[PDB]
Curated annotation (Swiss-Prot), chain B:
It comes from Homo sapiens. It comes from the Eukaryota. The lineage of its organism: Eukaryota, Metazoa, Chordata, Craniata, Vertebrata. This is Neurofibromin truncated.
Amino acid sequence: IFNDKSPEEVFMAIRNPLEWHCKQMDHFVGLNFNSNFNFALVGHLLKGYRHPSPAIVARTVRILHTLLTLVNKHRNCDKFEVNTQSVAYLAALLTVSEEVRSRCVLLDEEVLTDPKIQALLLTVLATLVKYTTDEFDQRILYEYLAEASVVFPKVFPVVHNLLDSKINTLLSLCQDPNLLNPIHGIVQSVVYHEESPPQYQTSYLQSFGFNGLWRFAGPFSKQTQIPDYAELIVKFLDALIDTYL
Amino acid sequence: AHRPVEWVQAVVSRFDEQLPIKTGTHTKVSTEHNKECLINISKYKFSLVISGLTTILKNVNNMRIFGEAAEKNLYLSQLIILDTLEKCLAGQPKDTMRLDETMLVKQLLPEICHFLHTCRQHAAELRNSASGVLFSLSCNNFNAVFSRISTRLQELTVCDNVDVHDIELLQYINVDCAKLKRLLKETAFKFKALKKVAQLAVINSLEKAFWNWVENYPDEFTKLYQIPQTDMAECA
């Protein structure tokens, strides 16, 4: 069924009929698929790395693989061919996939000309490292962020808000000059520009309807938000059963 | 927002933790990169970096060191601090125009000269580092140093154990042809109504200040003998 269409093409089509109720859900969470379908799906699937059980993590990795390959094959390109869509999954799989840590450049300037997509990629890479623990993954992500900061000085100031606490803690205690070097380069570029306005800050994502990408992928809570967004979920499910049954 | 300042402050705290005075090789591999941090920061932070370094040095200068190894640790901590400051000032372009660092230079008068005020072996290394620091300062904030020298000369002319301190600073001030001519003029309209000790101190400053001018600029000296300068000749 995905031979003639992209994952967004199929999946965002059966929701359009009841997009009215679902829109409230997206606004409530901060996962506006209509803005960035692939990035919203990646943002959802990101908790897989945070799951307690080691088995669910491996599935999360497959699920991306299957998403990325399906997306790439739709444009008739290489599996690891960096593009607008493939950017998110390539970023997510980078920390785990060895064949993705080899074929990455990642921060393409000719392709990632859109400020928003670059901003989302930066935010995802930042969230993937804020809760991360792996030292090798931290080094890889830090190096990618450093390369991007040079490549994308304009947007790097917006994604630094979440990275602030982690950098401050690391810059005070962490004693890996290999890791510290990219952090130092990032700090240097941050000190360089002092012109970006609030539209080049968090509000850029927050007005792109993706404010929760820095909050969603966090640790699993304890039975708190279950009742909160259940109201839309129940209504959404009722609507889904109404139009298709 | 305004987080870059916070990071600059965090790196400053990193210096505050890597000092040999408190620590007593964890801050050997990273500290070198952690000091190259501020060294590069001075090219961009400029005044903020100078302020942080000056505060760190003044805290170093304002110390007790009651024991024995404490002075040994400080002898290295302040030496590294001075080396880093001198490197930062040398790296910083002259286009920064650090006139707003007038207060910083005033603090350095008690900080960069925290040991050379009294001027009484690590003392020699500190003196060399402070001479380099003052030389770097002269390349940008020459005006503040000359103003301090002129104020000291005016104060000492009216006035005795020693007061050539803050008046003999010309000994390490980076001299220049026009700067040397101005210094000669200022000393000329001070010399007659001056203390004999003050006159000797001015003389001692001027001889090797001229030596400094020759060494730093071995082009102006040949120019003086090539194309005559009436003002310099009259002052001489």
